[model samples]
Target: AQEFVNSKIQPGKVVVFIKPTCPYSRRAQEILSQLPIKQGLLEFVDITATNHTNEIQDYLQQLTGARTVPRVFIGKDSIGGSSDLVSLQQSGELLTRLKQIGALQ
Candidate 1:
């Protein structure tokens, strides 16, 4: 399951492992979509879509060391949830990182 996440990242991709009804996941979407990321660079993998909640979340904890998501990743670096984004976007880490990773336009 972890390898599935490991497999999806591209050098310039932003991955969001999400569960739709999650408030933070919803917030994560709002925050990320606000950025001027390149077309198709921002993507969300709906873990609940495939009934792999346990499978994926199980693997996610190994990497992030906790189970909850809206686990945003810039390339291969796990960037955590919307709470983190709120700060990152405000403090300038989000924009710079998006540009640095070549994820923004």
Candidate 2:
């Protein structure tokens, strides 16, 4: 379980821990999809689809101190919820951040 969390957090351009029917997760998905990320760089793990939803949420809580949907990661950095993502978008740093992490050209 620790290894799973570690891998999810460590690799790729972005990883979003989400649940179906979560409004914030929907918004986060929309926002992230609009980013200049390449194909396969964005991963959305639908927690509700898994039987170990609570376990994954608990592990995320331990890692981030918040067990909310749309728990997002940009490479090795945790970016929190949809609001935080909007902040990055508004500040125009989201693209730069992606580039910094080698997700964009």
Candidate 3:
């Protein structure tokens, strides 16, 4: 996810809006973990959790117009879902895109 996109649109710094049991979400996390990001700096929210609720989901729909898992947000931009990430990685643009978005820093 793009940090600025998360901050500006998602109202968070780095929100990996995900579902704990989702396979795509798990893959997203696994891929993200391999990056140069730090543990404490990341903000992961599990929407499927009853405690977290769908308040964020509602907001995300209003913002991105979609209720989907692996909604990667960096600042405020909607970086698409897990499949998009896999595409980026497959094309070898994930790292560069991440660097451009400051996620690598």
Candidate 4:
């Protein structure tokens, strides 16, 4: 199960654990949605849609140290939730990271 979570995050510019009904999840998407991220580049795993939501959430918490709705990963590193993401964006670090990975122009 942990391996499955890892595999999902291992090969993407951005990977997010989401819940369709969560505001934080929606806000996370709103932030990322502004970027010109191509399809498959910004991947979402909807927790609500899965039968193993609690298990997945637990695995993500152990993996990223963030037990929130929008557990976001940039490449392999977890950038945490919406607030963390907003911090990175405000700090200009997020764009730098994106550019480093050739995910942005």
- Summarize candidate 3's per-residue lDDT along 15-104 as a digit string, tens digits: 577889879888888877776664455666676664434676676777787777788765555667889777877887766655555655
Best by lDDT: 1
Model 3: number of backbone collisions: 16
In model 3, where do residues sit more than 4 Å from their true spots?
1-13, 49-52
Kindly give the stretch of ten consecutive residues in candidate 4 with the minimal lDDT sum.
Answer: 3-12
**Which pairs of residues collide in candidate 2?**
none
> Which window of ten consecutive residues has the lowest lDDT sum in model 3?
3-12
Provide C-alpha RMSD values for all models, in order: 1.3, 1.5, 4.7, 1.6
Cα-lDDT of candidate 2: 0.80
Q: lDDT tens digits, residues 6-100, model 4? A: 87775347888889997988888898888777566887789777677888889988887778888888888788798889899989898777767
Task: Please rank every candidate by TM-score, starting with the best.
Answer: 1, 4, 2, 3
Q: How close is candidate 3 to the true structure, as a TM-score?
A: 0.71
Cα misplacement distance, residue 103 of candidate 1 (Å): 0.7
Tens digits of per-residue lDDT, candidate 1, 1-105, equal: 856888887678998988988788888888787788888889988999878789888888887766786888887777677687678888988777777778888
Candidate 1 segments whose C-alpha is farther than 4 A from its true place: none
Flag clash pairs in model 4: none
Ranked candidates (lDDT, high to low): 1, 4, 2, 3
Model 1 TM-score relative to the real fold: 0.91
Question: Going through the candidates in order, what is the number of backbone clashes in each?
Answer: 0, 0, 16, 0
After TM-score superposition, the amount by which residue 4's alpha carbon in candidate 3 deviates from its true location, in angstroms, is: 16
